[PDB]
Amino acid sequence: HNMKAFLDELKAENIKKFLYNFTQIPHLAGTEQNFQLAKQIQSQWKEFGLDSVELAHYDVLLSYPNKTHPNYISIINEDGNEIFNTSLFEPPPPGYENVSDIVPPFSAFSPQGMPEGDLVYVNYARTEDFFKLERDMKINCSGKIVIARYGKVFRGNKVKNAQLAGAKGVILYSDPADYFAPGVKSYPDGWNLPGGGVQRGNILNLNGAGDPLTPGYPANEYAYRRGIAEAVGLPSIPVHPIGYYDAQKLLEKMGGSAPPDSSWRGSLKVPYNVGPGFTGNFSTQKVKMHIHSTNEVTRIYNVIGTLRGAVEPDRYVILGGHRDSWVFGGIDPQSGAAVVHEIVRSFGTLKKEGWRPRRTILFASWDAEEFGLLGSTEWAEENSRLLQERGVAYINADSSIEGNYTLRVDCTPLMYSLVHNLTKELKSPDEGFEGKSLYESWTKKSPSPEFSGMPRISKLGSGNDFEVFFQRLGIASGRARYTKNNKFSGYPLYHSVYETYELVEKFYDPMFKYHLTVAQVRGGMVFELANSIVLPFDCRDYAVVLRKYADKIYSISMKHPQEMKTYSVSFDSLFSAVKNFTEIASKFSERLQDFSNPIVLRMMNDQLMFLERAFIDPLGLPDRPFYRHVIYAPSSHNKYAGESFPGIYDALFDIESKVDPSKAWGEVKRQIYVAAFTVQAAAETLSEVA
């Protein structure tokens, strides 16, 4: 009963069976079908061997189209005739066409409205696209309808950016440049997005809050709710997504200025003129949106399974991923959920033979992840005192595949050594690496930009259920999946009705060998975290990255040498703290090596568990109280991306444009002090205790 026993028990054939079982009907959050699947998983996890399996339910704000009053966009002529209408539904894939309850494309949490106006094209609607338009091209978006292509950043960041530019509506569309790979056919005959395909998705800006109505507290039976006008994160302008057939019709008539450069041109046979409005002949036509979706408080259900630890039952290692999908969820999330189900089955097989892990393992099937990480966040709000005093680590398990090229890992530096060591022990599933390790294929295909013979491991931001555990509570977190060779844009059929079981079985992973490889990485990590006598964290790896992040933020500031002189902006404290951390971590690692004494063992493992916790500031980041980690936060310009020393980064961002430089540079210095203090305080938790 060791790790090898556990890993050998995992089977590709079982992952395939579960994936098929989870993807026959839609499992939209708050629907009866999704509740039924929750009850099924609860049942099976009990049969598989877990000690306890419970549903934790909450009542949260969700959003749905109006079934009898469809959302659509028109071009309207000078007499108010709607001369072109976008589609009311995606053409269903073969053999489905008669499935009911497929939600039509919509942007969850869009307000209602029927705005009409002239279009402006804003590329990906990134912060820098809006700077280009407004500062360089001197185009004003105020009172316009903006059209933006999906890709590059989280869609909620686009809508926030459009709102602050003064837009009165936003139309999001999938351009073939970003969602149609050359030389591959459209679904059902390949994995590309057809012109009628549309990406669903929420457009909230919650900044970690969870349910819009109950920030800070679980949305239980007696919860006090904010009124809709005070809810967190809701957009103030209507938003709707469309496919590229419809986009072509809206973009083909565009006039005004030419695109400022080629990085603004997608692959449609149109000019990609920025506008505002249509060319001379159509100058009197307008665009009109019709959005009628409603927000409603709805019950959601998480399944929480416990396997009690034999030695340290009050230390929790958590494996979690979501169960709700926009439609069938063939990749997102069921390729992850199927992997979690097979991991639970394997741990339960060991348990039935009398084994128990050293620490407690909790398994979670989260609900309403697609509506803003609601299920994981509410549960973590409810259980925050247990998690912050007992939580060892959180390993996420959303989509296992988004390509079939190589491994993609994002995690805390504390898990770098664990990931390197485990992947060296695992077989590569890749063509041309038979008999080689996963570490070898991964390092070859995704080399570290910094180091020779090491793979890339990225930072954690947000955009998945680890967010509350890592950014709010400071629990060491990690994720691993197979990916493509567009990092933040999604695979072509992302959030479309075409993301089905057949997509996966025919085009992504017919032998389920990439799924199996991901189950071995996720399950391998959980097993080591839950069973290793000393926690498998290496504090020296945090010291290395802290120096890199300090160099990088210093370099950004140093683009403004005159201001650093004028305002006496010194990074000396932060480098001093990083030096101290490096020195203390080196000595702690010696003791961890040099130290039969279980209280000594519980003391050193507590120092390792609470090291991530030490990077939490209880006052949070500026205007984002639920992002409390001082080293990492989700980028203010792109929730999906992690940013390092975020409080200093945001103080410096676009600082040359601030009207009161004294005040702006004062705030940079404040954030340097907070960062240096927190690094030093984290270092001190690794000193001898008395």
Ligand X SMILES: O=C(O)CC[C@H](CP(=O)(O)O)C(=O)O
Ligand Y SMILES: *[C@@H]1O[C@H](CO)[C@@H](O[C@@H]2O[C@H](CO)[C@@H](O)[C@H](O)[C@H]2NC(C)=O)[C@H](O)[C@H]1NC(C)=O
Ligand Z SMILES: *[C@@H]1O[C@H](CO)[C@@H](O)[C@H](O)[C@H]1NC(C)=O
Ligand U SMILES: *[C@@H]1O[C@H](CO)[C@@H](O[C@@H]2O[C@H](CO)[C@@H](O[C@@H]3O[C@H](CO)[C@@H](O)[C@H](O[C@H]4O[C@H](CO)[C@@H](O)[C@H](O)[C@@H]4O)[C@@H]3O)[C@H](O)[C@H]2NC(C)=O)[C@H](O)[C@H]1NC(C)=O
Q: How far apart are CB 690 and a copy of itself at their closest, in Å?
A: 4
The Cα-based distances of 449 to 413, 488, 546 in angstroms read 16, 18, 16
Q: Any contact of residue 66 with ligand Z (CB under 6 A)?
A: yes
- Contact positions with Cl ion (CB under 5 A) in 446-485: 479
From 178, 128, 137, select the one nearest 273 (Cα to Cα): 137
Q: Any contact of residue 676 with ligand U (CB under 6 A)?
A: yes
The secondary element (H helix, E strand) that includes residue 9 is helix 3-9
Q: Any contact of residue 582 with ligand U (CB under 6 A)?
A: no
CA angle 3, 5, 11 (to 5 degrees): 110
Q: State which of residues 4, 69, 552, 559 lies at the interface with ligand Z (CB under 6 A).
A: 69
CB-nearer residue toward a copy of itself: 312 or 430: 312
- Contact positions with a copy of itself (CB under 8 A) in 345-384: 360, 382-384
CA distance 308 to 297: 34
CA distance 547 to 578: 6
Q: How far apart are CB 405 and ligand U at their closest, in Å?
A: 43
Question: 306 touches which of ligand Z, a copy of itself, Cl ion, none (CB within 5 to 8 A by kind)?
Answer: a copy of itself
Question: 577 touches which of Cl ion, ligand U, ligand Z, none (CB within 5 to 8 A by kind)?
Answer: ligand U
What's phi and psi for 57, nearest 5 deg?
-110, 155
CB-nearer residue toward a copy of itself: 383 or 443: 383
- Contact positions with Zn ion (CB under 5 A) in 383-412: 398
From 156, 123, 289, 296, select the one nearest 235 (Cα to Cα): 156
Which three-class secondary structure string do you get for 87-108? CCCCCCCCCCCCCCCCCCCCEE
DSSP 362-416: EEEEES-GGGTSHHHHHHHHHTHHHHHHHEEEEEE-S-SBS-SSEEEEEE-GGGH
The CA radius of gyration of the chain, in Å to the nearest whole number, is 25
Which sign does the torsion angle of CA 63, 218, 154, 653 carry? positive
Q: How far apart are CB 238 and ligand X at their closest, in Å?
A: 18
Q: Any contact of residue 332 with Zn ion (CB under 5 A)?
A: yes
Torsion of CA 154, 160, 166, 168, to 10 degrees: 70
Catalytic center residues: 369, 570, 606, 629
DSSP bridge partners of 644:
632
DSSP 281: G
Residue 481 among known ligand-binding residues: yes
From 533, 659, 687, select the one nearest 596 (Cα to Cα): 533
Q: Any contact of residue 639 with ligand X (CB under 6 A)?
A: yes
Q: Residue 335, exposed/middle/buried by CB under 10 A (0-12, 13-18, 19+)?
A: buried
Residues 6+ apart with CB under 8 A from 460: 410, 411, 412, 466, 470, 471, 477, 479, 632, 642
Q: How far apart are CB 322 and Zn ion at their closest, in Å?
A: 6
Question: 554 touches which of ligand Z, a copy of itself, Cl ion, none (CB within 5 to 8 A by kind)?
Answer: none
Q: Which residue has the tokens 């098929």?
A: 20
The Cα-based distances of 286 to 289, 402, 563 in angstroms read 10, 38, 47
CB-nearer residue toward Zn ion: 169 or 333: 333
- Contact positions with ligand Z (CB under 6 A) in 191-210: 191
Question: 412 touches which of Zn ion, Cl ion, ligand Y, none (CB within 5 to 8 A by kind)?
Answer: none
Q: Any contact of residue 614 with a copy of itself (CB under 8 A)?
A: yes
Q: State which of residues 573, 582, 589, 685 lies at the interface with ligand U (CB under 6 A).
A: 573
CA distance from start to end of the chain: 38
Residue 257 among known ligand-binding residues: no
Binding site for ligand Y (CB under 6 A): 21, 24, 40, 43-44, 74, 82-85, 417-418, 421, 536, 538, 593
Q: Any contact of residue 396 with Cl ion (CB under 5 A)?
A: yes
Residue 462 among known ligand-binding residues: yes
What's phi and psi for 455, nearest 5 deg?
-80, 160
Q: How far apart are CB 305 and ligand X at their closest, in Å?
A: 21
CB-nearer residue toward ligand X: 23 or 202: 202
Q: Which residue has the tokens 């991964």?
A: 442
Question: Residue 37 has which token pair?
Answer: 């699947």
Contact 482, 402 (CB under 8 A): yes
CA distance 364 to 371: 17
Q: Any contact of residue 524 with ligand X (CB under 6 A)?
A: no
In the shown chain, the binding pattern of residues 472 to 511 toward ligand Z, with x for contact by CB under 6 A and - for none, equals ------------x----------------------xx---
Q: Which residue has the tokens 């205790």?
A: 689
CA distance 401 to 335: 7
Q: State which of residues 464, 477, 483, 520 lies at the interface with ligand X (CB under 6 A).
A: 464
Q: State which of residues 142, 236, 448, 662 lies at the interface with ligand Z (CB under 6 A).
A: 142
- Contact positions with ligand Z (CB under 6 A) in 248-307: 294
Question: 332 touches which of a copy of itself, ligand X, Ca ion, none (CB within 5 to 8 A by kind)?
Answer: ligand X
Question: 586 touches which of ligand Y, a copy of itself, Cl ion, none (CB within 5 to 8 A by kind)?
Answer: none
Question: 313 touches which of Ca ion, ligand U, a copy of itself, none (CB within 5 to 8 A by kind)?
Answer: a copy of itself
Question: 211 touches which of ligand U, ligand X, Ca ion, none (CB within 5 to 8 A by kind)?
Answer: Ca ion
Question: Residue 502 has which token pair?
Answer: 């057949």
Question: 479 touches which of a copy of itself, Zn ion, Cl ion, none (CB within 5 to 8 A by kind)?
Answer: Cl ion
Residue 463 among known ligand-binding residues: yes
What's phi and psi for 297, nearest 5 deg?
-70, 125
What's phi and psi for 365, nearest 5 deg?
-120, 105
- 551-558 contacts: CB < 8 A, separation 24 or more? 552/644, 553/644, 553/645, 553/648, 553/649, 553/652, 556/649, 556/652, 557/648, 557/652, 557/668
Say how many residues touch ligand X, by CB under 6 A: 12
Question: 373 touches which of a copy of itself, ligand X, ligand U, none (CB within 5 to 8 A by kind)?
Answer: ligand X
Q: Any contact of residue 321 with Zn ion (CB under 5 A)?
A: no
- Contact positions with a copy of itself (CB under 8 A) in 648-687: 666, 669-670, 672-674, 676-677, 681-682, 684-685
Q: Any contact of residue 612 with ligand X (CB under 6 A)?
A: no
**Binding-site ranges for ligand Z (CB under 6 A):** 66, 68-69, 140, 142-143, 191, 294, 403-404, 484, 507-508
Q: Which residues bind a copy of itself (CB under 8 A)?
A: 51, 216-218, 220, 222-224, 306, 308-309, 311-314, 316, 360, 382-386, 389-390, 572-573, 598-599, 602-603, 606-607, 610, 613-614, 617-619, 625, 666, 669-670, 672-674, 676-677, 681-682, 684-685, 689-690
Q: Which residues are annotated as a binding site for Ca(2+)?
A: 214, 217, 378, 381
Name the site residues for ligand X (rule: CB under 6 A).
201-202, 332, 369-370, 372-373, 398, 462-464, 639
Residues annotated in a binding site? 155, 202, 214, 217, 322, 332, 369-370, 378, 381, 398, 462-464, 479-481, 494-495, 639-640
Residues making up the annotated binding site for Zn(2+) are: 322, 332, 370, 398, 495
Residues that bind ligand U (CB under 6 A): 221, 573, 576-577, 580, 676, 680
